[PDB]
JSON list of C-alpha atoms and ligand atoms in Angstrom, two decimals:
[
{"chain": "A", "resi": 1, "resn": "UNK", "atom": "CA", "xyz": [-26.83, 12.20, 0.99]},
{"chain": "A", "resi": 2, "resn": "UNK", "atom": "CA", "xyz": [-24.67, 11.14, -1.90]},
{"chain": "A", "resi": 3, "resn": "UNK", "atom": "CA", "xyz": [-22.95, 14.87, -1.68]},
{"chain": "A", "resi": 4, "resn": "UNK", "atom": "CA", "xyz": [-20.78, 13.45, 1.16]},
{"chain": "A", "resi": 5, "resn": "UNK", "atom": "CA", "xyz": [-19.16, 11.51, -1.57]},
{"chain": "A", "resi": 6, "resn": "UNK", "atom": "CA", "xyz": [-15.60, 12.74, -1.96]},
{"chain": "A", "resi": 7, "resn": "UNK", "atom": "CA", "xyz": [-15.67, 13.23, -5.72]},
{"chain": "A", "resi": 8, "resn": "UNK", "atom": "CA", "xyz": [-19.08, 15.20, -5.65]},
{"chain": "A", "resi": 9, "resn": "UNK", "atom": "CA", "xyz": [-17.26, 18.34, -6.61]},
{"chain": "A", "resi": 10, "resn": "UNK", "atom": "CA", "xyz": [-15.83, 16.69, -9.92]},
{"chain": "A", "resi": 11, "resn": "UNK", "atom": "CA", "xyz": [-19.12, 16.10, -12.05]},
{"chain": "A", "resi": 12, "resn": "UNK", "atom": "CA", "xyz": [-19.14, 15.97, -15.75]},
{"chain": "A", "resi": 13, "resn": "UNK", "atom": "CA", "xyz": [-21.35, 16.03, -18.79]},
{"chain": "A", "resi": 14, "resn": "UNK", "atom": "CA", "xyz": [-21.24, 12.97, -21.07]},
{"chain": "A", "resi": 15, "resn": "UNK", "atom": "CA", "xyz": [-22.74, 13.06, -24.55]},
{"chain": "A", "resi": 16, "resn": "UNK", "atom": "CA", "xyz": [-23.75, 9.39, -24.61]},
{"chain": "A", "resi": 17, "resn": "UNK", "atom": "CA", "xyz": [-22.80, 5.89, -23.32]},
{"chain": "A", "resi": 18, "resn": "UNK", "atom": "CA", "xyz": [-19.87, 5.67, -25.54]},
{"chain": "A", "resi": 19, "resn": "UNK", "atom": "CA", "xyz": [-18.32, 8.75, -24.45]},
{"chain": "A", "resi": 20, "resn": "UNK", "atom": "CA", "xyz": [-18.64, 7.54, -20.85]},
{"chain": "A", "resi": 21, "resn": "UNK", "atom": "CA", "xyz": [-17.29, 3.86, -21.40]},
{"chain": "A", "resi": 22, "resn": "UNK", "atom": "CA", "xyz": [-14.41, 5.53, -23.32]},
{"chain": "A", "resi": 23, "resn": "UNK", "atom": "CA", "xyz": [-13.39, 7.69, -20.57]},
{"chain": "A", "resi": 24, "resn": "UNK", "atom": "CA", "xyz": [-13.61, 5.13, -17.98]},
{"chain": "A", "resi": 25, "resn": "UNK", "atom": "CA", "xyz": [-11.31, 2.97, -19.92]},
{"chain": "A", "resi": 26, "resn": "UNK", "atom": "CA", "xyz": [-8.93, 5.72, -20.79]},
{"chain": "A", "resi": 27, "resn": "UNK", "atom": "CA", "xyz": [-8.53, 7.05, -17.08]},
{"chain": "A", "resi": 28, "resn": "UNK", "atom": "CA", "xyz": [-8.55, 3.39, -15.68]},
{"chain": "A", "resi": 29, "resn": "UNK", "atom": "CA", "xyz": [-5.76, 2.40, -18.09]},
{"chain": "A", "resi": 30, "resn": "UNK", "atom": "CA", "xyz": [-3.49, 5.59, -16.92]},
{"chain": "A", "resi": 31, "resn": "UNK", "atom": "CA", "xyz": [-4.19, 4.85, -13.31]},
{"chain": "A", "resi": 32, "resn": "UNK", "atom": "CA", "xyz": [-3.49, 1.24, -13.52]},
{"chain": "A", "resi": 33, "resn": "UNK", "atom": "CA", "xyz": [-0.34, 1.59, -15.48]},
{"chain": "A", "resi": 34, "resn": "UNK", "atom": "CA", "xyz": [1.23, 3.55, -12.62]},
{"chain": "A", "resi": 35, "resn": "UNK", "atom": "CA", "xyz": [1.17, 0.14, -10.53]},
{"chain": "A", "resi": 36, "resn": "UNK", "atom": "CA", "xyz": [3.36, -1.77, -12.94]},
{"chain": "A", "resi": 37, "resn": "UNK", "atom": "CA", "xyz": [6.52, -1.13, -11.22]},
{"chain": "A", "resi": 38, "resn": "UNK", "atom": "CA", "xyz": [5.40, -1.19, -7.66]},
{"chain": "A", "resi": 39, "resn": "UNK", "atom": "CA", "xyz": [6.70, -4.26, -5.94]},
{"chain": "A", "resi": 40, "resn": "UNK", "atom": "CA", "xyz": [4.44, -6.42, -3.89]},
{"chain": "A", "resi": 41, "resn": "UNK", "atom": "CA", "xyz": [7.02, -6.09, -0.99]},
{"chain": "A", "resi": 42, "resn": "UNK", "atom": "CA", "xyz": [6.14, -2.21, -0.81]},
{"chain": "A", "resi": 43, "resn": "UNK", "atom": "CA", "xyz": [2.37, -2.62, -1.25]},
{"chain": "A", "resi": 44, "resn": "UNK", "atom": "CA", "xyz": [2.16, -1.94, 2.35]},
{"chain": "A", "resi": 45, "resn": "UNK", "atom": "CA", "xyz": [4.80, 0.94, 2.69]},
{"chain": "A", "resi": 46, "resn": "UNK", "atom": "CA", "xyz": [3.26, 4.19, 3.75]},
{"chain": "A", "resi": 47, "resn": "UNK", "atom": "CA", "xyz": [4.72, 7.47, 2.56]},
{"chain": "A", "resi": 48, "resn": "UNK", "atom": "CA", "xyz": [4.54, 10.60, 4.77]},
{"chain": "A", "resi": 49, "resn": "UNK", "atom": "CA", "xyz": [2.66, 13.05, 2.78]},
{"chain": "A", "resi": 50, "resn": "UNK", "atom": "CA", "xyz": [0.22, 10.40, 1.22]},
{"chain": "A", "resi": 51, "resn": "UNK", "atom": "CA", "xyz": [-2.53, 8.74, 3.15]},
{"chain": "A", "resi": 52, "resn": "UNK", "atom": "CA", "xyz": [-2.78, 5.63, 1.36]},
{"chain": "A", "resi": 53, "resn": "UNK", "atom": "CA", "xyz": [-0.43, 2.77, 0.76]},
{"chain": "A", "resi": 54, "resn": "UNK", "atom": "CA", "xyz": [-0.65, 1.35, -2.93]},
{"chain": "A", "resi": 55, "resn": "UNK", "atom": "CA", "xyz": [-2.65, -1.59, -1.59]},
{"chain": "A", "resi": 56, "resn": "UNK", "atom": "CA", "xyz": [-4.92, 0.83, 0.32]},
{"chain": "A", "resi": 57, "resn": "UNK", "atom": "CA", "xyz": [-5.10, 2.93, -2.80]},
{"chain": "A", "resi": 58, "resn": "UNK", "atom": "CA", "xyz": [-6.36, 0.15, -5.03]},
{"chain": "A", "resi": 59, "resn": "UNK", "atom": "CA", "xyz": [-8.64, -1.33, -2.23]},
{"chain": "A", "resi": 60, "resn": "UNK", "atom": "CA", "xyz": [-10.58, 1.96, -2.30]},
{"chain": "A", "resi": 61, "resn": "UNK", "atom": "CA", "xyz": [-11.34, 1.61, -6.08]},
{"chain": "A", "resi": 62, "resn": "UNK", "atom": "CA", "xyz": [-12.20, -1.96, -5.67]},
{"chain": "A", "resi": 63, "resn": "UNK", "atom": "CA", "xyz": [-14.46, -1.00, -2.81]},
{"chain": "A", "resi": 64, "resn": "UNK", "atom": "CA", "xyz": [-16.42, 1.66, -4.45]},
{"chain": "A", "resi": 65, "resn": "UNK", "atom": "CA", "xyz": [-16.83, -0.35, -7.72]},
{"chain": "A", "resi": 66, "resn": "UNK", "atom": "CA", "xyz": [-17.98, -3.33, -6.04]},
{"chain": "A", "resi": 67, "resn": "UNK", "atom": "CA", "xyz": [-20.48, -1.36, -4.31]},
{"chain": "A", "resi": 68, "resn": "UNK", "atom": "CA", "xyz": [-21.84, 0.36, -7.56]},
{"chain": "A", "resi": 69, "resn": "UNK", "atom": "CA", "xyz": [-22.16, -2.99, -9.19]},
{"chain": "A", "resi": 70, "resn": "UNK", "atom": "CA", "xyz": [-23.87, -4.34, -6.26]},
{"chain": "A", "resi": 71, "resn": "UNK", "atom": "CA", "xyz": [-26.65, -1.55, -6.24]},
{"chain": "A", "resi": 72, "resn": "UNK", "atom": "CA", "xyz": [-27.37, -2.49, -9.74]},
{"chain": "A", "resi": 73, "resn": "UNK", "atom": "CA", "xyz": [-27.46, -6.18, -9.42]},
{"chain": "A", "resi": 74, "resn": "UNK", "atom": "CA", "xyz": [-29.38, -6.11, -6.23]},
{"chain": "A", "resi": 75, "resn": "UNK", "atom": "CA", "xyz": [-31.95, -3.78, -8.02]},
{"chain": "A", "resi": 76, "resn": "UNK", "atom": "CA", "xyz": [-31.98, -5.86, -11.15]},
{"chain": "A", "resi": 77, "resn": "UNK", "atom": "CA", "xyz": [-32.89, -8.90, -8.86]},
{"chain": "A", "resi": 78, "resn": "UNK", "atom": "CA", "xyz": [-35.90, -7.14, -7.33]},
{"chain": "A", "resi": 79, "resn": "UNK", "atom": "CA", "xyz": [-34.14, -6.14, -4.28]},
{"chain": "A", "resi": 80, "resn": "UNK", "atom": "CA", "xyz": [-34.22, -2.93, -2.15]},
{"chain": "A", "resi": 81, "resn": "UNK", "atom": "CA", "xyz": [-31.01, -1.30, -1.93]},
{"chain": "A", "resi": 82, "resn": "UNK", "atom": "CA", "xyz": [-29.29, 0.49, 0.91]},
{"chain": "A", "resi": 83, "resn": "UNK", "atom": "CA", "xyz": [-26.58, 3.04, -0.13]},
{"chain": "A", "resi": 84, "resn": "UNK", "atom": "CA", "xyz": [-23.87, 3.63, 0.21]},
{"chain": "A", "resi": 85, "resn": "UNK", "atom": "CA", "xyz": [-23.63, 0.18, 1.92]},
{"chain": "A", "resi": 86, "resn": "UNK", "atom": "CA", "xyz": [-25.45, -2.04, 4.26]},
{"chain": "A", "resi": 87, "resn": "UNK", "atom": "CA", "xyz": [-23.03, -1.46, 7.17]},
{"chain": "A", "resi": 88, "resn": "UNK", "atom": "CA", "xyz": [-22.42, 2.39, 6.62]},
{"chain": "A", "resi": 89, "resn": "UNK", "atom": "CA", "xyz": [-24.31, 5.65, 5.84]},
{"chain": "A", "resi": 90, "resn": "UNK", "atom": "CA", "xyz": [-23.43, 8.54, 3.75]},
{"chain": "A", "resi": 91, "resn": "UNK", "atom": "CA", "xyz": [-21.99, 10.42, 6.64]},
{"chain": "A", "resi": 92, "resn": "UNK", "atom": "CA", "xyz": [-19.89, 7.29, 7.75]},
{"chain": "A", "resi": 93, "resn": "UNK", "atom": "CA", "xyz": [-17.49, 7.33, 4.63]},
{"chain": "A", "resi": 94, "resn": "UNK", "atom": "CA", "xyz": [-14.40, 7.53, 6.65]},
{"chain": "A", "resi": 95, "resn": "UNK", "atom": "CA", "xyz": [-15.44, 4.24, 8.42]},
{"chain": "A", "resi": 96, "resn": "UNK", "atom": "CA", "xyz": [-16.53, 2.80, 5.05]},
{"chain": "A", "resi": 97, "resn": "UNK", "atom": "CA", "xyz": [-12.94, 3.47, 3.71]},
{"chain": "A", "resi": 98, "resn": "UNK", "atom": "CA", "xyz": [-11.41, 1.55, 6.70]},
{"chain": "A", "resi": 99, "resn": "UNK", "atom": "CA", "xyz": [-13.80, -1.10, 6.11]},
{"chain": "A", "resi": 100, "resn": "UNK", "atom": "CA", "xyz": [-12.38, -1.13, 2.23]},
{"chain": "A", "resi": 101, "resn": "UNK", "atom": "CA", "xyz": [-8.91, -1.49, 3.69]},
{"chain": "A", "resi": 102, "resn": "UNK", "atom": "CA", "xyz": [-9.69, -4.23, 6.25]},
{"chain": "A", "resi": 103, "resn": "UNK", "atom": "CA", "xyz": [-11.55, -6.19, 3.62]},
{"chain": "A", "resi": 104, "resn": "UNK", "atom": "CA", "xyz": [-9.39, -5.85, 0.70]},
{"chain": "A", "resi": 105, "resn": "UNK", "atom": "CA", "xyz": [-5.99, -4.16, 1.27]},
{"chain": "A", "resi": 106, "resn": "UNK", "atom": "CA", "xyz": [-4.43, -7.33, 2.65]},
{"chain": "A", "resi": 107, "resn": "UNK", "atom": "CA", "xyz": [-4.61, -8.81, -0.84]},
{"chain": "A", "resi": 108, "resn": "UNK", "atom": "CA", "xyz": [-1.51, -8.76, -3.25]},
{"chain": "A", "resi": 109, "resn": "UNK", "atom": "CA", "xyz": [-1.40, -5.81, -5.81]},
{"chain": "A", "resi": 110, "resn": "UNK", "atom": "CA", "xyz": [-1.78, -8.60, -8.58]},
{"chain": "A", "resi": 111, "resn": "UNK", "atom": "CA", "xyz": [-5.15, -9.65, -7.03]},
{"chain": "A", "resi": 112, "resn": "UNK", "atom": "CA", "xyz": [-6.46, -6.10, -6.47]},
{"chain": "A", "resi": 113, "resn": "UNK", "atom": "CA", "xyz": [-5.50, -5.31, -10.20]},
{"chain": "A", "resi": 114, "resn": "UNK", "atom": "CA", "xyz": [-7.35, -8.23, -11.56]},
{"chain": "A", "resi": 115, "resn": "UNK", "atom": "CA", "xyz": [-10.30, -7.49, -9.35]},
{"chain": "A", "resi": 116, "resn": "UNK", "atom": "CA", "xyz": [-10.42, -3.85, -10.44]},
{"chain": "A", "resi": 117, "resn": "UNK", "atom": "CA", "xyz": [-10.05, -5.05, -13.94]},
{"chain": "A", "resi": 118, "resn": "UNK", "atom": "CA", "xyz": [-12.91, -7.34, -13.75]},
{"chain": "A", "resi": 119, "resn": "UNK", "atom": "CA", "xyz": [-15.17, -4.70, -12.29]},
{"chain": "A", "resi": 120, "resn": "UNK", "atom": "CA", "xyz": [-14.21, -2.09, -15.10]},
{"chain": "A", "resi": 121, "resn": "UNK", "atom": "CA", "xyz": [-15.25, -4.70, -17.65]},
{"chain": "A", "resi": 122, "resn": "UNK", "atom": "CA", "xyz": [-18.44, -5.28, -15.40]},
{"chain": "A", "resi": 123, "resn": "UNK", "atom": "CA", "xyz": [-19.23, -1.55, -15.22]},
{"chain": "A", "resi": 124, "resn": "UNK", "atom": "CA", "xyz": [-18.96, -1.49, -18.93]},
{"chain": "A", "resi": 125, "resn": "UNK", "atom": "CA", "xyz": [-21.62, -4.32, -19.26]},
{"chain": "A", "resi": 126, "resn": "UNK", "atom": "CA", "xyz": [-23.83, -2.47, -17.11]},
{"chain": "A", "resi": 127, "resn": "UNK", "atom": "CA", "xyz": [-23.60, 0.66, -19.05]},
{"chain": "A", "resi": 128, "resn": "UNK", "atom": "CA", "xyz": [-24.40, -1.39, -22.36]},
{"chain": "A", "resi": 129, "resn": "UNK", "atom": "CA", "xyz": [-27.32, -3.06, -20.51]},
{"chain": "A", "resi": 130, "resn": "UNK", "atom": "CA", "xyz": [-29.15, 0.19, -19.50]},
{"chain": "A", "resi": 131, "resn": "UNK", "atom": "CA", "xyz": [-30.98, 2.42, -21.91]},
{"chain": "A", "resi": 132, "resn": "UNK", "atom": "CA", "xyz": [-29.50, 6.03, -22.67]},
{"chain": "A", "resi": 133, "resn": "UNK", "atom": "CA", "xyz": [-32.73, 7.06, -20.57]},
{"chain": "A", "resi": 134, "resn": "UNK", "atom": "CA", "xyz": [-31.72, 4.78, -17.69]},
{"chain": "A", "resi": 135, "resn": "UNK", "atom": "CA", "xyz": [-28.57, 5.85, -17.49]},
{"chain": "A", "resi": 136, "resn": "UNK", "atom": "CA", "xyz": [-28.86, 9.70, -18.18]},
{"chain": "A", "resi": 137, "resn": "UNK", "atom": "CA", "xyz": [-32.15, 10.74, -16.73]},
{"chain": "A", "resi": 138, "resn": "UNK", "atom": "CA", "xyz": [-33.26, 11.14, -13.19]},
{"chain": "A", "resi": 139, "resn": "UNK", "atom": "CA", "xyz": [-35.37, 8.75, -11.46]},
{"chain": "A", "resi": 140, "resn": "UNK", "atom": "CA", "xyz": [-34.58, 5.69, -13.32]},
{"chain": "A", "resi": 141, "resn": "UNK", "atom": "CA", "xyz": [-33.18, 3.58, -10.50]},
{"chain": "A", "resi": 142, "resn": "UNK", "atom": "CA", "xyz": [-34.65, 3.19, -6.96]},
{"chain": "A", "resi": 143, "resn": "UNK", "atom": "CA", "xyz": [-30.82, 2.96, -5.63]},
{"chain": "A", "resi": 144, "resn": "UNK", "atom": "CA", "xyz": [-29.86, 6.07, -7.18]},
{"chain": "A", "resi": 145, "resn": "UNK", "atom": "CA", "xyz": [-32.67, 8.23, -5.47]},
{"chain": "A", "resi": 146, "resn": "UNK", "atom": "CA", "xyz": [-32.30, 6.44, -2.41]},
{"chain": "A", "resi": 147, "resn": "UNK", "atom": "CA", "xyz": [-30.50, 8.96, -0.32]},
{"chain": "A", "resi": 148, "resn": "UNK", "atom": "CA", "xyz": [-31.50, 12.36, -1.88]},
{"chain": "A", "resi": 149, "resn": "UNK", "atom": "CA", "xyz": [-31.70, 15.42, 0.32]},
{"chain": "A", "resi": 150, "resn": "UNK", "atom": "CA", "xyz": [-30.84, 18.20, -2.14]},
{"chain": "A", "resi": 151, "resn": "UNK", "atom": "CA", "xyz": [-29.91, 17.80, -5.82]},
{"chain": "A", "resi": 152, "resn": "UNK", "atom": "CA", "xyz": [-30.87, 14.26, -7.67]},
{"chain": "A", "resi": 153, "resn": "UNK", "atom": "CA", "xyz": [-28.20, 12.44, -9.46]},
{"chain": "A", "resi": 154, "resn": "UNK", "atom": "CA", "xyz": [-28.76, 10.28, -12.36]},
{"chain": "A", "resi": 155, "resn": "UNK", "atom": "CA", "xyz": [-27.07, 6.61, -12.65]},
{"chain": "A", "resi": 156, "resn": "UNK", "atom": "CA", "xyz": [-24.16, 7.95, -14.78]},
{"chain": "A", "resi": 157, "resn": "UNK", "atom": "CA", "xyz": [-23.08, 10.42, -12.15]},
{"chain": "A", "resi": 158, "resn": "UNK", "atom": "CA", "xyz": [-22.80, 7.74, -9.56]},
{"chain": "A", "resi": 159, "resn": "UNK", "atom": "CA", "xyz": [-20.66, 5.80, -11.95]},
{"chain": "A", "resi": 160, "resn": "UNK", "atom": "CA", "xyz": [-18.53, 8.86, -12.97]},
{"chain": "A", "resi": 161, "resn": "UNK", "atom": "CA", "xyz": [-17.55, 9.66, -9.45]},
{"chain": "A", "resi": 162, "resn": "UNK", "atom": "CA", "xyz": [-16.66, 6.34, -8.63]},
{"chain": "A", "resi": 163, "resn": "UNK", "atom": "CA", "xyz": [-14.37, 5.67, -11.85]},
{"chain": "A", "resi": 164, "resn": "UNK", "atom": "CA", "xyz": [-13.43, 8.60, -13.85]},
{"chain": "A", "resi": 165, "resn": "UNK", "atom": "CA", "xyz": [-12.89, 11.02, -11.24]},
{"chain": "A", "resi": 166, "resn": "UNK", "atom": "CA", "xyz": [-10.92, 8.90, -8.48]},
{"chain": "A", "resi": 167, "resn": "UNK", "atom": "CA", "xyz": [-8.78, 7.23, -11.15]},
{"chain": "A", "resi": 168, "resn": "UNK", "atom": "CA", "xyz": [-7.70, 10.71, -11.98]},
{"chain": "A", "resi": 169, "resn": "UNK", "atom": "CA", "xyz": [-6.97, 11.95, -8.18]},
{"chain": "A", "resi": 170, "resn": "UNK", "atom": "CA", "xyz": [-5.66, 8.74, -7.12]},
{"chain": "A", "resi": 171, "resn": "UNK", "atom": "CA", "xyz": [-3.24, 8.43, -10.08]},
{"chain": "A", "resi": 172, "resn": "UNK", "atom": "CA", "xyz": [-1.99, 11.78, -8.95]},
{"chain": "A", "resi": 173, "resn": "UNK", "atom": "CA", "xyz": [-1.57, 10.27, -5.38]},
{"chain": "A", "resi": 174, "resn": "UNK", "atom": "CA", "xyz": [0.21, 7.03, -6.48]},
{"chain": "A", "resi": 175, "resn": "UNK", "atom": "CA", "xyz": [2.49, 9.13, -8.76]},
{"chain": "A", "resi": 176, "resn": "UNK", "atom": "CA", "xyz": [3.54, 11.28, -5.61]},
{"chain": "A", "resi": 177, "resn": "UNK", "atom": "CA", "xyz": [4.06, 8.00, -3.65]},
{"chain": "A", "resi": 178, "resn": "UNK", "atom": "CA", "xyz": [6.28, 6.45, -6.15]},
{"chain": "A", "resi": 179, "resn": "UNK", "atom": "CA", "xyz": [8.49, 9.66, -6.57]},
{"chain": "A", "resi": 180, "resn": "UNK", "atom": "CA", "xyz": [9.15, 9.55, -2.87]},
{"chain": "A", "resi": 181, "resn": "UNK", "atom": "CA", "xyz": [9.29, 5.98, -2.17]},
{"chain": "A", "resi": 182, "resn": "UNK", "atom": "CA", "xyz": [10.63, 4.34, -5.45]},
{"chain": "B", "resi": 1, "resn": "LIG", "atom": "BR1", "xyz": [-3.98, 8.59, -0.89]}
]
């Protein structure tokens, strides 16, 4: 079911936890830097050949990182987890994305950047909290095995496709937006 994820074709091998954390921080910094000169008054400005506004772009990352953190926190607390979310299934990502916009896009860029920054720090704490086995071997978290229909994904794959991969593709999109609008 997780193959419905839009970055399922951008998987990566990692050597260890440190390599994973370093890549998340590097790609996050390059992505977030692009918003430094985007004014709040243009956060909802839509460019023609770009799907999302700057706020919707940030809202998407806040949305997904909030979900990954929730799956693990809920499991840590002994709960049974529904993925990708309680309201939407893996074949309803389009609706989940609109929910991200409705839930988060109205916030200021400053507030969205603060939330994403906090989430990157929490994801690093999560990586540090799991053994190398829990992170890199299959069948270590019930939430990661929850939707499997074809190939199994280890915890690190879920972290990677929701951080390193979109930070790269959405950085391309926000740069395109700035070239047009600014
Ligand atoms: Br976009």
